[PDB]
């Protein structure tokens, strides 16, 4: 509709003005804090990783010697070099940010120490091109700091050692980057290859219930758990980066889908299951998926496939993708959605089942008006195309009462039950 188009635009303007750095087009400090806050807390996404901080050298002197305009161009050029170098690490998607003046930050969930050293050094070399270019007249260009973080670290503390790493880089008149002080890489490689071959991944399930009546179950989200040697389960937050590191995500998708379709035959409930970019990229993996769905036409009305917003293929592949699924009787949704409509585009025509809102916007939504205001704008656009919204990571009675007020369709999170075994 022209109505959708207009509502989506308001929504984008609000997203951009709220969460995007005007100058560079990167994310801003608020978005980075929201992400750091949330991305250090949930079991499904990587526990550990690295924070990278980057500080342009002598910003004030540059402004004085080169002028404000020439300095703004350098800042954008720095932002662009940072995007390029981080692109190699798909987990940094949407987490490349400009904090203050000449200070940038990137969060890299799951990144190993070896990878962080590689990024530091490749970024350093990249940025040196900005001196050769004359974009800056400081030969050193910028200071870089890397600091590790784990699940359960306070965001304040993570920023603090990011700052120490950065300060350590500075006291070295010599060397622009510093990394603060596997494994075991080989154990994960063998653990995972075997586990896949042996089908030793369990299905866990988390209820997704109606926001407007929490006793009513909408579907169960399926989550993958790895068994250890003692039949203990390991969370996806820990193993998934390794699978992606080894390039085995598509293997898990295939195993998970066959297993889910086997288990659905014994009951009448609806389920949802991830479909990774890994599966979507290899046409041979994709076709096995269609093959597998064709054989289970009967279950299509009960299974929704979910793609992460950060893993969306081209609108073209997306459009045909929803088309093939619809012919098989299976439905498609987005999860981790952050309102990037200029990236979905033809959304109105996809006939998606729902959009699940990234838990980062939901956390503390009863206490942070910018989040509440942004989700309301998304609900406005979605409402006009009859596309329901489902909030992820609802943990609090306060968050839930606000989601109700906003008239959203669904809610999921600790408040309603953790991922557990079952039917």
Short mmCIF file of C-alpha atoms in Angstrom, two decimals:
data_model
loop_
_atom_site.label_atom_id
_atom_site.label_comp_id
_atom_site.label_asym_id
_atom_site.label_seq_id
_atom_site.Cartn_x
_atom_site.Cartn_y
_atom_site.Cartn_z
CA UNK A 1 0.00 0.00 0.00
CA UNK A 2 0.97 3.65 -0.28
CA UNK A 3 0.05 3.51 3.38
CA UNK A 4 2.60 0.82 4.14
CA UNK A 5 5.24 2.73 2.12
CA UNK A 6 4.59 5.85 4.15
CA UNK A 7 4.45 4.03 7.51
CA UNK A 8 7.66 2.14 6.75
CA UNK A 9 9.39 5.46 5.93
CA UNK A 10 8.45 7.02 9.26
CA UNK A 11 9.75 3.83 10.84
CA UNK A 12 13.10 4.04 8.97
CA UNK A 13 13.51 7.72 9.79
CA UNK A 14 12.99 6.86 13.45
CA UNK A 15 15.44 3.94 13.32
CA UNK A 16 18.14 6.01 11.58
CA UNK A 17 17.72 9.08 13.73
CA UNK A 18 17.68 6.92 16.90
CA UNK A 19 20.35 4.30 16.23
CA UNK A 20 22.51 5.37 13.30
CA UNK A 21 25.40 7.83 13.21
CA UNK A 22 24.35 10.62 10.88
CA UNK A 23 27.86 11.22 9.54
CA UNK A 24 29.17 7.74 8.70
CA UNK A 25 26.02 5.68 8.40
CA UNK A 26 27.37 3.29 11.01
CA UNK A 27 25.48 2.54 14.23
CA UNK A 28 25.73 5.08 17.05
CA UNK A 29 26.65 4.90 20.75
CA UNK A 30 23.16 4.25 22.02
CA UNK A 31 22.71 1.32 19.64
CA UNK A 32 26.14 -0.02 20.61
CA UNK A 33 25.32 0.13 24.31
CA UNK A 34 21.94 -1.52 23.74
CA UNK A 35 23.69 -4.28 21.85
CA UNK A 36 26.58 -4.68 24.30
CA UNK A 37 24.00 -4.77 27.12
CA UNK A 38 21.90 -7.48 25.53
CA UNK A 39 24.55 -9.46 23.66
CA UNK A 40 26.29 -10.39 26.91
CA UNK A 41 23.25 -12.04 28.50
CA UNK A 42 21.37 -14.72 26.50
CA UNK A 43 22.26 -18.44 26.09
CA UNK A 44 21.42 -18.69 22.35
CA UNK A 45 23.96 -16.16 21.11
CA UNK A 46 27.70 -16.32 21.62
CA UNK A 47 28.88 -16.08 25.23
CA UNK A 48 32.39 -14.88 24.55
CA UNK A 49 34.05 -12.58 22.05
CA UNK A 50 36.05 -9.45 21.51
CA UNK A 51 35.36 -5.78 21.68
CA UNK A 52 37.38 -3.61 19.30
CA UNK A 53 37.91 0.11 19.95
CA UNK A 54 39.47 2.47 17.43
CA UNK A 55 40.55 6.06 18.12
CA UNK A 56 41.60 8.36 15.30
CA UNK A 57 44.87 10.06 16.23
CA UNK A 58 44.92 13.85 16.87
CA UNK A 59 41.35 14.54 15.75
CA UNK A 60 41.56 18.08 17.17
CA UNK A 61 44.80 18.81 15.34
CA UNK A 62 43.34 17.45 12.11
CA UNK A 63 40.37 19.76 12.46
CA UNK A 64 42.70 22.68 13.05
CA UNK A 65 45.18 21.90 10.26
CA UNK A 66 42.77 20.45 7.69
CA UNK A 67 39.39 22.03 8.43
CA UNK A 68 36.06 20.56 9.56
CA UNK A 69 34.98 19.30 6.15
CA UNK A 70 38.25 17.48 5.32
CA UNK A 71 38.03 15.94 8.79
CA UNK A 72 34.47 14.70 8.27
CA UNK A 73 35.62 12.96 5.08
CA UNK A 74 38.39 11.23 6.96
CA UNK A 75 35.91 10.02 9.56
CA UNK A 76 33.71 8.49 6.86
CA UNK A 77 36.76 6.97 5.20
CA UNK A 78 37.78 5.43 8.54
CA UNK A 79 34.24 4.09 9.00
CA UNK A 80 34.39 2.59 5.54
CA UNK A 81 37.74 0.86 6.16
CA UNK A 82 36.36 -0.52 9.42
CA UNK A 83 33.23 -1.87 7.66
CA UNK A 84 35.35 -3.60 4.99
CA UNK A 85 37.70 -5.28 7.46
CA UNK A 86 34.87 -6.38 9.73
CA UNK A 87 32.81 -7.75 6.83
CA UNK A 88 35.03 -10.86 6.89
CA UNK A 89 33.60 -11.60 10.32
CA UNK A 90 29.83 -11.92 9.71
CA UNK A 91 29.08 -11.90 13.45
CA UNK A 92 30.04 -8.17 13.46
CA UNK A 93 27.01 -7.55 11.26
CA UNK A 94 25.12 -4.52 12.52
CA UNK A 95 27.65 -4.08 15.33
CA UNK A 96 30.03 -1.66 13.60
CA UNK A 97 29.59 1.73 15.36
CA UNK A 98 30.91 5.28 15.89
CA UNK A 99 30.80 6.15 19.61
CA UNK A 100 32.20 9.70 19.88
CA UNK A 101 34.08 12.12 17.59
CA UNK A 102 36.99 9.98 16.40
CA UNK A 103 36.11 6.87 18.36
CA UNK A 104 34.61 3.72 16.85
CA UNK A 105 33.71 0.35 18.37
CA UNK A 106 32.82 -3.11 17.05
CA UNK A 107 31.45 -6.05 19.01
CA UNK A 108 32.47 -9.50 17.72
CA UNK A 109 30.46 -12.30 19.44
CA UNK A 110 32.28 -15.65 19.35
CA UNK A 111 35.52 -14.29 17.88
CA UNK A 112 38.66 -16.13 19.03
CA UNK A 113 41.90 -14.48 20.13
CA UNK A 114 43.64 -15.52 16.94
CA UNK A 115 40.90 -13.91 14.91
CA UNK A 116 41.02 -10.72 16.94
CA UNK A 117 44.79 -10.38 16.32
CA UNK A 118 44.21 -10.94 12.62
CA UNK A 119 41.52 -8.22 12.55
CA UNK A 120 43.72 -5.77 14.47
CA UNK A 121 46.59 -6.17 12.05
CA UNK A 122 44.49 -6.16 8.87
CA UNK A 123 42.58 -3.09 10.09
CA UNK A 124 45.86 -1.36 10.94
CA UNK A 125 47.32 -1.94 7.51
CA UNK A 126 44.01 -0.83 5.89
CA UNK A 127 43.86 2.42 7.79
CA UNK A 128 47.45 3.27 6.82
CA UNK A 129 46.11 3.83 3.30
CA UNK A 130 44.33 6.90 4.70
CA UNK A 131 47.69 8.58 5.38
CA UNK A 132 49.02 7.70 1.88
CA UNK A 133 45.79 9.20 0.54
CA UNK A 134 46.30 12.45 2.43
CA UNK A 135 42.97 11.90 4.12
CA UNK A 136 44.89 12.29 7.35
CA UNK A 137 48.34 13.87 7.79
CA UNK A 138 49.11 11.68 10.82
CA UNK A 139 51.19 8.72 9.61
CA UNK A 140 50.09 6.49 12.49
CA UNK A 141 46.36 7.25 11.60
CA UNK A 142 44.67 5.57 14.58
CA UNK A 143 45.04 3.58 17.77
CA UNK A 144 43.30 0.20 18.04
CA UNK A 145 42.43 -1.78 21.16
CA UNK A 146 41.01 -5.33 21.49
CA UNK A 147 39.54 -6.74 24.69
CA UNK A 148 37.91 -10.14 25.40
CA UNK A 149 34.43 -10.52 26.92
CA UNK A 150 32.50 -13.54 28.19
CA UNK A 151 28.86 -14.31 29.00
CA UNK A 152 27.96 -12.58 32.27
CA UNK A 153 30.54 -9.82 32.07
CA UNK A 154 29.16 -6.41 32.97
CA UNK A 155 29.10 -4.12 29.93
CA UNK A 156 30.78 -1.44 32.02
CA UNK A 157 33.71 -3.79 32.72
CA UNK A 158 33.99 -4.78 29.02
CA UNK A 159 34.16 -1.12 28.03
CA UNK A 160 36.70 -0.55 30.80
CA UNK A 161 39.20 -3.07 29.46
CA UNK A 162 38.49 -1.89 25.94
CA UNK A 163 39.71 1.47 27.24
CA UNK A 164 42.78 -0.11 28.88
CA UNK A 165 43.61 -1.93 25.62
CA UNK A 166 43.32 1.36 23.78
CA UNK A 167 45.48 3.11 26.40
CA UNK A 168 48.07 0.36 26.12
CA UNK A 169 48.23 0.94 22.36
CA UNK A 170 48.86 4.67 23.02
CA UNK A 171 51.85 4.21 25.37
CA UNK A 172 53.61 2.41 22.53
CA UNK A 173 55.03 5.20 20.38
CA UNK A 174 55.79 2.28 18.15
CA UNK A 175 52.78 0.04 17.38
CA UNK A 176 49.21 1.16 16.68
CA UNK A 177 47.27 -1.80 18.09
CA UNK A 178 47.13 -3.78 21.31
CA UNK A 179 45.28 -6.94 22.23
CA UNK A 180 44.78 -7.59 25.95
CA UNK A 181 45.37 -11.05 27.45
CA UNK A 182 41.00 -22.02 20.31
CA UNK A 183 40.74 -23.33 22.80
CA UNK A 184 40.60 -26.02 22.28
CA UNK A 185 40.07 -25.50 18.55
CA UNK A 186 41.01 -29.11 17.67
CA UNK A 187 38.68 -30.54 20.32
CA UNK A 188 35.73 -28.60 18.90
CA UNK A 189 36.53 -29.71 15.34
CA UNK A 190 36.42 -33.42 16.28
CA UNK A 191 33.61 -32.98 18.83
CA UNK A 192 31.40 -31.31 16.22
CA UNK A 193 32.24 -33.49 13.22
CA UNK A 194 31.41 -36.58 15.30
CA UNK A 195 28.30 -35.11 16.85
CA UNK A 196 26.95 -34.29 13.40
CA UNK A 197 27.71 -37.74 11.98
CA UNK A 198 26.12 -39.32 15.07
CA UNK A 199 23.03 -37.07 15.23
CA UNK A 200 23.88 -36.24 18.85
CA UNK A 201 22.00 -32.90 18.89
CA UNK A 202 18.72 -32.69 20.88
CA UNK A 203 15.63 -30.64 20.12
CA UNK A 204 14.73 -28.14 22.80
CA UNK A 205 11.57 -26.05 22.64
CA UNK A 206 10.52 -22.69 23.93
CA UNK A 207 6.88 -21.56 24.03
CA UNK A 208 5.87 -18.53 21.99
CA UNK A 209 2.55 -17.28 23.37
CA UNK A 210 -0.07 -14.64 22.51
CA UNK A 211 0.90 -11.29 23.95
CA UNK A 212 -2.78 -10.50 24.45
CA UNK A 213 -3.46 -13.83 26.32
CA UNK A 214 -0.35 -15.56 27.64
CA UNK A 215 -2.03 -18.93 28.27
CA UNK A 216 -2.48 -19.39 24.53
CA UNK A 217 0.45 -21.03 22.77
CA UNK A 218 1.21 -19.78 19.26
CA UNK A 219 4.04 -22.19 18.50
CA UNK A 220 7.21 -23.60 20.00
CA UNK A 221 10.56 -22.27 18.79
CA UNK A 222 12.93 -25.19 18.20
CA UNK A 223 16.55 -24.74 19.50
CA UNK A 224 19.56 -26.96 18.83
CA UNK A 225 21.46 -28.51 21.76
CA UNK A 226 24.65 -30.51 21.50
CA UNK A 227 25.16 -33.53 23.78
CA UNK A 228 28.56 -33.95 25.47
CA UNK A 229 30.27 -37.22 26.35
CA UNK A 230 28.12 -37.65 29.47
CA UNK A 231 24.85 -36.91 27.69
CA UNK A 232 24.90 -33.32 28.95
CA UNK A 233 23.55 -30.60 26.68
CA UNK A 234 25.66 -27.66 25.41
CA UNK A 235 24.04 -24.35 24.38
CA UNK A 236 24.09 -22.99 20.81
CA UNK A 237 25.81 -19.83 22.13
CA UNK A 238 28.90 -21.95 22.68
CA UNK A 239 28.93 -24.30 19.66
CA UNK A 240 27.48 -22.26 16.75
CA UNK A 241 30.45 -19.96 16.25
CA UNK A 242 32.59 -23.12 15.90
CA UNK A 243 30.25 -24.65 13.32
CA UNK A 244 30.39 -21.39 11.37
CA UNK A 245 34.15 -21.28 11.84
CA UNK A 246 34.41 -24.83 10.40
CA UNK A 247 31.70 -24.20 7.78
CA UNK A 248 29.29 -26.87 9.04
CA UNK A 249 26.17 -24.84 9.75
CA UNK A 250 24.36 -26.30 6.73
CA UNK A 251 25.01 -29.76 8.17
CA UNK A 252 23.29 -28.80 11.37
CA UNK A 253 20.34 -27.25 9.50
CA UNK A 254 19.77 -30.47 7.57
CA UNK A 255 20.00 -32.67 10.67
CA UNK A 256 17.71 -30.32 12.63
CA UNK A 257 15.10 -30.15 9.94
CA UNK A 258 14.90 -33.93 9.48
CA UNK A 259 14.73 -34.34 13.24
CA UNK A 260 12.02 -31.72 13.72
CA UNK A 261 9.90 -33.13 10.93
CA UNK A 262 10.20 -36.62 12.46
CA UNK A 263 9.09 -35.32 15.86
CA UNK A 264 6.14 -33.21 14.69
CA UNK A 265 4.33 -36.32 13.43
CA UNK A 266 3.61 -37.37 17.01
CA UNK A 267 1.69 -34.24 18.00
CA UNK A 268 -0.51 -31.36 16.82
CA UNK A 269 1.53 -28.33 17.87
CA UNK A 270 3.11 -25.69 15.67
CA UNK A 271 6.86 -25.19 15.54
CA UNK A 272 9.45 -22.75 14.23
CA UNK A 273 12.99 -23.55 13.02
CA UNK A 274 16.05 -21.46 11.91
CA UNK A 275 17.28 -21.61 8.37
CA UNK A 276 20.84 -20.29 8.17
CA UNK A 277 22.53 -18.17 5.49
CA UNK A 278 24.91 -21.15 5.16
CA UNK A 279 22.00 -23.30 3.95
CA UNK A 280 20.74 -20.45 1.79
CA UNK A 281 24.09 -19.92 0.06
CA UNK A 282 24.87 -23.48 -1.03
CA UNK A 283 22.26 -24.27 -3.74
CA UNK A 284 22.88 -27.98 -3.16
CA UNK A 285 22.00 -27.65 0.51
CA UNK A 286 19.01 -25.49 -0.32
CA UNK A 287 17.60 -28.07 -2.72
CA UNK A 288 17.89 -30.88 -0.20
CA UNK A 289 15.78 -28.70 2.07
CA UNK A 290 13.09 -28.35 -0.60
CA UNK A 291 13.39 -32.09 -1.29
CA UNK A 292 12.81 -32.76 2.42
CA UNK A 293 9.85 -30.33 2.64
CA UNK A 294 8.17 -31.83 -0.47
CA UNK A 295 8.08 -35.23 1.25
CA UNK A 296 6.33 -33.74 4.31
CA UNK A 297 3.61 -31.57 2.69
CA UNK A 298 1.28 -32.74 5.48
CA UNK A 299 3.33 -30.85 8.12
CA UNK A 300 3.63 -27.54 6.26
CA UNK A 301 0.68 -25.92 8.01
CA UNK A 302 2.48 -26.51 11.34
CA UNK A 303 6.11 -25.48 10.61
CA UNK A 304 7.47 -21.93 10.10
CA UNK A 305 11.04 -21.47 8.87
CA UNK A 306 12.83 -18.40 10.38
CA UNK A 307 15.64 -16.42 8.85
CA UNK A 308 17.64 -13.90 10.88
CA UNK A 309 17.40 -10.34 9.53
CA UNK A 310 21.22 -10.29 9.42
CA UNK A 311 21.24 -13.30 7.09
CA UNK A 312 18.67 -12.14 4.54
CA UNK A 313 19.54 -12.97 0.94
CA UNK A 314 18.87 -10.51 -1.88
CA UNK A 315 15.22 -9.42 -2.11
CA UNK A 316 15.24 -11.43 -5.33
CA UNK A 317 16.23 -14.74 -3.74
CA UNK A 318 14.05 -13.88 -0.76
CA UNK A 319 10.99 -13.39 -2.99
CA UNK A 320 11.39 -16.68 -4.86
CA UNK A 321 12.29 -18.36 -1.60
CA UNK A 322 8.93 -17.48 -0.03
CA UNK A 323 7.34 -18.54 -3.30
CA UNK A 324 8.78 -22.09 -3.25
CA UNK A 325 7.89 -22.46 0.43
CA UNK A 326 4.31 -21.35 -0.23
CA UNK A 327 3.92 -23.97 -2.96
CA UNK A 328 5.09 -26.62 -0.49
CA UNK A 329 2.69 -25.36 2.16
CA UNK A 330 5.41 -24.08 4.49
CA UNK A 331 5.45 -20.58 5.91
CA UNK A 332 8.36 -18.13 6.37
CA UNK A 333 9.22 -15.54 9.02
CA UNK A 334 12.01 -13.14 10.01
CA UNK A 335 13.64 -13.16 13.45
CA UNK A 336 16.09 -10.75 15.06
CA UNK A 337 14.24 -8.06 13.13
CA UNK A 338 15.40 -4.48 13.60
CA UNK A 339 13.12 -2.64 11.23
CA UNK A 340 15.45 -2.38 8.21
CA UNK A 341 12.60 -2.09 5.71
CA UNK A 342 14.81 -0.52 3.03
CA UNK A 343 16.57 -3.89 3.18
CA UNK A 344 13.46 -6.08 2.96
CA UNK A 345 11.68 -3.78 0.52
CA UNK A 346 9.08 -5.96 -1.19
CA UNK A 347 8.03 -7.08 2.31
CA UNK A 348 4.44 -6.25 1.48
CA UNK A 349 4.44 -9.00 -1.17
CA UNK A 350 6.25 -11.75 0.74
CA UNK A 351 3.26 -12.80 2.82
CA UNK A 352 5.54 -13.63 5.75
CA UNK A 353 3.97 -15.28 8.77
CA UNK A 354 5.41 -12.91 11.41
CA UNK A 355 8.43 -10.81 12.30
CA UNK A 356 10.18 -11.58 15.56
CA UNK A 357 11.68 -8.45 17.09
CA UNK A 358 15.28 -8.68 18.25
CA UNK A 359 15.43 -9.01 22.05
CA UNK A 360 17.87 -6.09 22.12
CA UNK A 361 14.96 -3.65 21.57
CA UNK A 362 12.71 -5.42 24.05
CA UNK A 363 14.95 -5.53 27.07
CA UNK A 364 13.85 -2.79 29.50
CA UNK A 365 11.30 -1.47 26.97
CA UNK A 366 9.12 -0.36 29.89
CA UNK A 367 11.94 1.95 31.13
CA UNK A 368 13.50 3.18 27.86
CA UNK A 369 11.19 5.26 25.70
CA UNK A 370 13.38 5.21 22.61
CA UNK A 371 12.93 1.45 22.34
CA UNK A 372 9.20 1.65 22.99
CA UNK A 373 8.81 4.44 20.44
CA UNK A 374 10.77 2.55 17.80
CA UNK A 375 8.78 -0.71 18.22
CA UNK A 376 5.53 1.27 18.02
CA UNK A 377 6.63 2.64 14.67
CA UNK A 378 7.43 -0.85 13.43
CA UNK A 379 4.01 -2.11 14.64
CA UNK A 380 2.37 0.78 12.76
CA UNK A 381 3.97 -0.25 9.43
CA UNK A 382 3.40 -4.00 10.07
CA UNK A 383 -0.22 -3.46 11.15
CA UNK A 384 -0.96 -1.93 7.76
CA UNK A 385 0.01 -5.14 5.99
CA UNK A 386 -1.48 -7.50 8.53
CA UNK A 387 1.97 -8.73 9.56
CA UNK A 388 2.05 -9.73 13.23
CA UNK A 389 5.01 -8.85 15.51
CA UNK A 390 6.40 -11.16 18.17
CA UNK A 391 8.71 -9.82 20.89
CA UNK A 392 11.74 -11.96 21.83
CA UNK A 393 13.52 -12.11 25.20
CA UNK A 394 10.65 -10.93 27.36
CA UNK A 395 11.89 -11.36 30.96
CA UNK A 396 9.89 -8.98 33.05
CA UNK A 397 6.27 -8.33 34.02
CA UNK A 398 6.94 -4.68 33.12
CA UNK A 399 8.19 -5.48 29.61
CA UNK A 400 5.17 -7.69 29.02
CA UNK A 401 2.62 -5.06 30.14
CA UNK A 402 4.17 -2.58 27.65
CA UNK A 403 4.16 -5.17 24.80
CA UNK A 404 0.47 -5.73 25.59
CA UNK A 405 -0.21 -1.93 25.48
CA UNK A 406 1.48 -1.72 22.09
CA UNK A 407 -0.88 -4.37 20.77
CA UNK A 408 1.78 -6.79 19.59
CA UNK A 409 0.72 -10.30 18.67
CA UNK A 410 3.30 -12.57 20.36
CA UNK A 411 5.86 -12.83 23.20
CA UNK A 412 8.73 -15.20 23.94
CA UNK A 413 11.33 -15.28 26.69
CA UNK A 414 12.41 -16.37 30.13
CA UNK A 415 9.13 -15.04 31.58
CA UNK A 416 7.24 -17.83 29.78
CA UNK A 417 9.73 -20.67 30.05
CA UNK A 418 13.26 -21.55 29.00
CA UNK A 419 14.23 -23.87 26.14
CA UNK A 420 13.55 -27.41 27.43
CA UNK A 421 13.16 -30.91 25.98
CA UNK A 422 9.75 -32.21 24.84
CA UNK A 423 6.97 -32.56 22.27
#
